[PDB]
């Protein structure tokens, strides 16, 4: 008779990738050894981000990628992105980015390599940066999906700013009673 609650004994976290992809599981078998042997906290974060879902691995636009690369003290560092790097058509200059990502769109790849940049993978990053030295671990916007706009208190509460689920968007669609 021990007074201990069991409602949270089982921690809900990903200990392995839910994806059955062959190359992703090999990259995890590569970073399970790195995070276990090397004491670097970079391998510990990259290993956990390899487990995460696609919604937890958002795309990183090139514009936001360049913005965090053009910051001070990040001239010759490697942009590490555990996810996809999408091309941003709003920008027109690429400052020779050195990136390491799981997926890069055909538009972003044709602009990083054309500007003299270097594209790496996580098996090449383990060789160049085993501890993750001179690496800028960047993450895409996670709370930027449309799914997060409907999350909040409720649409029918004061000071809500929450988006309701509507079939159509117009004049006769949820605007009369409770909106004025």
């Amino acid at each position: 008779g021990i007074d201990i609650r069991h409602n949270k004994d089982r921690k809900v976290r990903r200990k392995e990738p839910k994806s059955q992809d062959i190359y992703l599981r090999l990259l995890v078998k590569l970073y399970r050894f790195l995070a276990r042997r090397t004491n670097s906290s970079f391998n510990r974060v990259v290993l956990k981000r390899l487990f995460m879902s696609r919604t937890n691995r958002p795309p990183l636009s090139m514009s936001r990628l360049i913005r965090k690369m053009k910051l001070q003290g990040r001239e010759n560092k490697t942009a590490v992105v555990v996810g996809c790097i999408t091309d941003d058509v709003r920008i027109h200059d690429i400052p020779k980015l050195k990136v390491c990502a799981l997926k890069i769109t055909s538009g972003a790849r044709s602009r990083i390599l054309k500007a003299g940049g270097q594209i790496m993978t996580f098996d090449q990053l383990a060789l160049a940066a085993p501890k993750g030295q001179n690496t800028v671990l960047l993450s895409g916007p996670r709370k930027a999906r449309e799914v997060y706009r409907h999350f909040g208190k409720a649409p029918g509460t004061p000071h809500s700013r929450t988006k309701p689920y509507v079939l159509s968007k117009g004049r006769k669609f949820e605007r009369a009673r409770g909106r004025r």
Binding site: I22, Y23, R25, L26, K29
Partner: protein, 118 residues
């Protein structure tokens, strides 16, 4: 690309025999008949296969040539060893240890060659 080929043949193979909570492989170049990464006889560039001779006496040490990878007709080099039990094991031991050819399968091939000679 052995690890790449492993993830495909890991659980889907015509040689995998899953029954009675055990998994055995029926590939020819497997020493333990075990469906594991190390003992899998088709995945690595260096494989060791100890088969019984065509007749009733002797063993056949099958090595995988280095250049014989995508040409199966000229990929394996068979070595017929029909000697006494102590000398046959000394030959298999020297084929593996002295050539640095799958030293992890050194004693696994000696135990298989010892069973074939019985």
């Amino acid at each position: 690309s052995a690890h790449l080929q492993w993830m495909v043949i890991r659980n889907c193979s015509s040689f995998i025999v899953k029954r009675n909570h055990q998994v055995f492989s029926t590939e020819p170049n497997n020493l333990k008949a075990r469906n594991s990464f190390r003992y899998n006889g088709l995945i690595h560039k260096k494989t060791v296969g100890v088969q019984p001779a065509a007749d009733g006496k002797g063993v056949i040490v099958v090595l995988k040539k280095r250049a014989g990878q995508r040409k199966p007709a000229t990929s394996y080099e068979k070595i017929s060893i029909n000697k006494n039990s102590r000398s046959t094991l000394s030959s298999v031991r020297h084929i593996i240890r002295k050539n640095n050819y799958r030293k992890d399968l050194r004693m696994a091939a000696l135990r298989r060659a010892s069973a074939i000679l019985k």
